[PDB]
Scaffold this active site. Structure first.
Site, short mmCIF file in Angstrom:
data_model
loop_
_atom_site.label_atom_id
_atom_site.label_comp_id
_atom_site.label_asym_id
_atom_site.label_seq_id
_atom_site.Cartn_x
_atom_site.Cartn_y
_atom_site.Cartn_z
N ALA C 33 1.08 -1.16 0.06
CA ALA C 33 -0.25 -0.05 -0.16
C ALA C 33 0.91 1.51 -0.27
O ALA C 33 1.66 1.49 0.42
CB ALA C 33 -1.07 -0.37 1.66
N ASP C 34 0.64 2.01 -1.34
CA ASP C 34 1.04 3.29 -0.79
C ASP C 34 0.47 4.44 -0.29
O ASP C 34 -0.21 4.00 0.27
CB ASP C 34 1.32 3.34 -2.63
N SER C 35 1.54 5.86 -0.16
CA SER C 35 0.63 6.88 0.13
C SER C 35 -0.91 6.96 0.21
O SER C 35 -1.36 6.99 0.87
CB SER C 35 1.18 8.05 -0.63
N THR C 38 -2.31 3.55 1.77
CA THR C 38 -3.09 4.07 3.21
C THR C 38 -3.93 4.82 3.50
O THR C 38 -4.55 4.45 4.95
CB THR C 38 -1.17 4.24 3.28
#
Lengths: 79, 50, 72, 50
Positions: C33-35, C38
């Site tokens: 999960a990226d920016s 998340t």
């Protein structure tokens, strides 16, 4: 007008079927022969009237097929 | 003035709750497409940032 | 329960397998999960338990174990 | 040889370009709606906290 080829058949298809190469080719094709790039006469002929031939043979419930490598052949349907 | 401002704050709070629910619902659906596009179809071809 | 409701939220917000999401599974490196992913994960965690979290204390959370630790 | 290859290429290219145009557009539409609602939610969040 009446008594005019277009009433019954496309001109290009009749032109193809009237060619001197057709009987040979037809005979062969029906027998299962594949047509490649080396037999120029035949290959060129095929290329020139592809869609007419396809449409024609369709009457028989058979596909006139063109592989990516440039060779023609006949594939029969279930019917 | 602070009591009056706490009323605007509460309006914003209710708006924020609504938006929160909507965003989460969008993500839930989009997840399936992400798992489905793992075929290397997404990296450049589909995700045209232009 | 809370310790499995956290998995319910994480798996369905990141799309990763339930087996993948262990207690120590970090979101960014393990779950990927990226920016924005998340961000949506923390929003969903807030919604599930109908609570709110501070910005800094929330961003400090970067793992399943940390997620539950702040949740429980 | 030319006559063969040129054809093949034309069909390849046309399918590729039209299919990507058809799919990527709506994929980006969805991504943009999700981005927009997330941005609105974050602005509301920050303003509420402050």
């Amino acid at each position: 007008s009446s008594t005019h080829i277009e009433q019954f058949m496309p001109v290009k298809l009749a032109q193809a079927l009237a060619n001197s190469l057709f009987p040979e080719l037809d005979s062969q094709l029906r027998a299962g022969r594949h047509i490649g790039i080396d037999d120029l006469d035949n290959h060129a002929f095929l290329m020139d009237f592809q869609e007419q031939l396809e449409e024609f043979y369709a009457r028989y419930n058979v596909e006139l097929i063109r592989a990516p490598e440039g060779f023609f052949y006949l594939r029969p349907r279930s019917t | 003035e602070m009591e009056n401002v706490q009323k605007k704050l509460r309006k914003l709070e209710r708006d924020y709750y609504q938006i929160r629910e909507q965003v989460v619902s969008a993500k839930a659906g989009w997840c399936a497409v992400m798992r489905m596009v793992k075929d290397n179809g997404v990296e450049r071809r589909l995700h045209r940032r232009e | 329960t809370i310790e499995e409701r956290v998995k319910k939220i994480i798996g369905e917000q990141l799309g990763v397998k339930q087996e993948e999401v262990t207690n120590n599974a970090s979101f960014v490196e393990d779950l990927g999960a990226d920016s924005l992913d998340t961000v949506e994960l923390v929003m969903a965690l807030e919604e599930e338990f109908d609570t709110e979290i501070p910005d800094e204390e929330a961003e400090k959370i970067t793992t399943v174990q940390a997620a539950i630790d702040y949740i429980n | 040889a030319i006559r063969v290859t040129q054809s093949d290429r034309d069909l390849f290219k046309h399918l590729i370009t039209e299919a990507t145009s058809y799919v990527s557009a709506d994929y980006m539409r969805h991504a943009n709606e999700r981005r927009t609602h997330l941005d609105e939610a974050l602005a509301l969040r920050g303003e509420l906290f402050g």
